[PDB]
Paper text:
In addition to its essential role in viral polyprotein processing, the SARS-CoV-2 3C-like protease (3CLpro) can cleave human immune signaling proteins, like NF-κB Essential Modulator (NEMO) and deregulate the host immune response. Functionally, 3CLpro recognizes a hydrophobic substrate residue at P2 (usually Phe or Leu), a Gln at P1, and Ser, Val, Asn, or Ala residues at P1’. NEMO is necessary for activating NF-κB during the canonical NF-κB response signaling pathway, which is a critical first response to viral infection.
Within the asymmetric unit, the C-terminal tail (Ser301-Gln306) of chain A inserts into the substrate-binding site of chain D. Additionally, the substrate-binding site of chain A is bound by the C-terminal tail of chain D from a neighboring symmetry equivalent dimer. This C-terminal tail-binding contributes to crystal lattice formation by connecting chains A and D to each other throughout the crystal. Our C145S construct terminates at the P1 position (Gln306) and so lacks the residues corresponding to P1’ to P3’. Thr26 and Thr190 form H-bonds with Ala233 (P2’) and Ala228 (P4) of the hNEMO peptide, respectively. This causes the distance between the Cɑ atoms of Thr26 and Thr190 to decrease.
Numbering used by the authors:
A (entry chain B): 1 to 305
B (entry chain A): 1 to 306
């Protein structure tokens, strides 16, 4: 019993984190076999970040310009190649602790654990979500760019994110490990801003299902909605559309509790209209939206890796 | 910027986790060097549990009665002793991933990371506080006993909690890694019940400070209070007494932000009396009490000018 914001076991990712210096600029890198990925903005300095020519700055740079450290040990860079917004430094040594991995691009509303690093040194792990506006509300200080977010999908670490920059609102943008940014953001100091954030409806419903599983029934009601009308109400509370796809990934939880998804949408309809009125669900006074359906299943079945 | 419930990385602990089976009971062990620590209730059938005598049950066991597994690989048990409520199984191999480590008993209010495991494999990691009534509000299912809490100081893992059992209220009870229970709890099947739970007052303040550090100020005020007039209002809202030991650890956060502890205590007093009034602090509608001052410094602190 109980329900917590649970992070993935960060073990198999801690072995992959390294330091990458270039000038006086230090950030973090991900070491997988004989390649070290990091933000291409390690090459820039403070002037260049105002308006960078990455293709002309990587020219005036050679292998010896990149210092790469793995604990006490040093690593020898035997090539480079900037793909999109991420650097891939070929190095002479394969990481012994390289796990079975893949590179994924996640859709908004999908969650992942973030391993916050400084100086190639993991400091903490937390569970995050890709906001609808393609940011994440992370916890990052100066020098954490290159820290990575990930899932464990069965036996295989799925790298989904690499931190680049902090936007002015306090939120955070980055790339997949192919270097292609999430959202409209770009690696340069300009007047970028995040959109307005909205709530990830399908995750809220997942969490209401968790609450039912763990014994909370008060928010349930005989009322009934259609998919269309729910979205009309929800939309005025900054809730993301619930699609027919969404209604399917909720079908497992629908059948474990015998509550149709549309009946749960009616429960959520009334919580939006009437509020919560100083009541808690699963130790919470707000509607949590950072647990996916699969996150619920995992915590409630005791899924291991 | 930002502020999350941040767990310590769990790798150093992942490499220690093993599966311990005895009879029909399977649970988790901790493989440090050539010893496996696990809860001693693994040797009980549920008929003994009703009123067991543990040194009597342990002297009936053979080494071969313990199935210990690390991955596919069975470990050979060569000895078995008790220390309070934990079994030390001597195995024949030393754990090659054994981190630098140490066993520490924590106090109520302090926090730690928990690696929830089943069958010696980890399910995930989360931060917890030792509640003042010596329970924890974990997420633990059947098979989770043997899971451990831990803090990490540099390279060094300070194991502080081992999970044993779930109480009727759905909170969790366990021991330090020397076998002594946190709280008045016993590993036999009796009526047991958690004492009254209260809010860790020092921790809330640490979190109001973390809020001010992240640019929330809406809940501050010019009002100031005596420590005693606070506790008078606080106690009636189910809060722990605040005391100089607490004030003197907030000191750095009170200094980094410029807000005298006694002023932060007048902010909280007003939050208690008037409620939050449809507002949020660090994305929360409740006052959070599972962040210690140290978890705040850990997470959102930098260079200070002298």
């Amino acid at each position: 019993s109980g329900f917590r914001k649970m992070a993935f076991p960060s073990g198999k990712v801690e072995g992959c984190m390294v330091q990458v210096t270039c000038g006086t600029t230090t950030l973090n890198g991900l070491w997988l076999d004989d390649v070290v990925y990091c933000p291409r903005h390690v090459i820039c300095t403070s002037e260049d970040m105002l308006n960078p020519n990455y293709e002309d700055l990587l020219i005036r740079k050679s292998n010896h310009n990149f210092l790469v450290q793995a604990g006490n040990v040093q690593l020898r860079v035997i090539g480079h190649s900037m793909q999109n917004c991420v650097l891939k430094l070929k190095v002479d040594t394969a990481n012994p602790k390289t796990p079975k991995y893949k590179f994924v691009r996640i859709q908004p509303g999908q969650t992942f654990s973030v391993l916050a690093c400084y100086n190639g040194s993991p400091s903490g792990v937390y569970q995050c979500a890709m906001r609808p506006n393609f940011t994440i509300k992370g916890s990052f200080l100066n020098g954490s760019s290159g820290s990575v977010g990930f899932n464990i999908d069965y036996d295989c670490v799925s790298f989904c994110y690499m931190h680049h920059m902090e936007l002015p609102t306090g939120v955070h943008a980055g790339t997949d490990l192919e270097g292609n940014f999430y959202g409209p953001f770009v690696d340069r100091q300009t007047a970028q801003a995040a959109g307005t954030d909205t709530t990830i409806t399908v995750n809220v419903l997942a969490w209401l299902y968790a609450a039912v599983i763990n014994g909370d029934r008060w928010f349930l009601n005989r009322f009934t909605t259609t998919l269309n009308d729910f979205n009309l109400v929800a939309m005025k509370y900054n809730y993301e559309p619930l699609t027919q796809d969404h209604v399917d990934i909720l079908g497992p939880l629908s059948a474990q509790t015998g509550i149709a998804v549309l009946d749960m949408c009616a429960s959520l309809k009334e919580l939006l209209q009437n509020g919560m009125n100083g009541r808690t669900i699963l130790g919470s006074a707000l509607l949590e939206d950072e647990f996916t359906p699969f996150d619920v299943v995992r915590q409630c079945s005791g899924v291991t890796f």
